């Protein structure tokens, strides 16, 4: 059966360590803590992108990071829209993340361009 | 987040077979809820207003037998 988990808040100061050393569940938690609770677009977008672009991370994590970029876009009024869009569009051609890119783009277009 | 996460997730529907993104409606509180995969069968979710759902989301809701209009 599917399991609901509402993201835990990981303190800002611990995030980069978790992203360097952490196992997959730790990393997902960090991505989601960023997605749901951090307000600094630039600080957060930078970190999500490094996960999304990292070829040594499993597709599950890369895809989640994109979905998380979708969440930031939904939540944060002062995002750089053009940067968010170029990012999501630059992924449309590679399959590991394409599907989440499309849904993150849905999030961008609704909350920030409509 | 949503009030009734677990049961609202169980009675949810996948929007498109190309994406694990699902959607449901809380029978109790009446809110519309979007769910995304975390890892494996684990999911997280957020509340949305009717006009913030896409055509696909709304189609898959009404047609699922979840909302009148």
Residue A68 and residue A32 in contact, taking contact as beta carbons nearer than 8 Å: yes
Rounded to whole angstroms, the Cα distance separating A6 from A9 reads: 10
Please provide residue A76's backbone torsions phi and psi, each rounded to the nearest 5 degrees.
Answer: -105, 115
The helix/strand/coil state of B23 is strand
Q: Is A3 on the interface with B (CB under 8 A)?
A: yes
CB atoms within 10 A of CB B16: 14
- Solved with: X-ray
Resolution of this model in Å is 2.4
CA distance B68 to chain A (A): 23
Q: Is A2's CB within 8 Å of B36's CB?
A: no
Residue A114 and residue B53 in contact, taking contact as beta carbons nearer than 8 Å: no
Return the domain boundaries, chain B. Answer: 1-69
Q: For tokens 């069968």, name the residue.
A: B41
Q: Is A22 on the interface with B (CB under 8 A)?
A: no
Q: Is A103's CB within 8 Å of B1's CB?
A: no
Q: How far is CA A45 from CA A9, A39, A61, A64, B17, in A?
A: 17, 10, 15, 13, 28
Q: Is A51 on the interface with B (CB under 8 A)?
A: no
The helix/strand/coil state of B53 is coil
- How many CA atoms lie less than 13 Å away from A93 in the CB half-sphere? 4
């Amino acid at each position: 059966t599917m399991r609901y988990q509402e993201p835990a808040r990981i303190p800002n100061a611990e995030i980069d360590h978790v992203l360097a050393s952490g196992n997959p569940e730790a990393i997902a938690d960090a991505c989601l803590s960023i997605a749901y609770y951090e307000d600094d677009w630039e600080w957060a977008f930078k970190r999500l992108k490094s996960v999304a672009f990292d070829l040594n991370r499993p597709d599950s994590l890369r895809s989640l990071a994109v979905t998380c970029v979708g969440h930031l876009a939904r939540r944060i009024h002062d995002l750089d829209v053009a940067m968010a869009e170029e990012f999501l569009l630059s992924l449309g051609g590679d399959q590991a993340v394409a599907s989440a890119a499309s849904d993150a783009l849905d999030d961008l277009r609704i909350f920030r361009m409509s | 987040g949503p009030s009734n996460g677990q049961s609202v997730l169980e009675n949810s529907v996948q929007v498109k077979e190309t994406s694990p993104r699902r959607v449901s409606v809380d029978p109790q509180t009446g809110e519309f809820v979007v769910f995304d995969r975390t890892l494996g069968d684990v999911y997280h979710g957020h509340v949305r207003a009717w006009k913030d759902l896409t055509s696909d989301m709304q189609n898959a809701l009404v047609r699922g037998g979840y909302v009148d209009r």
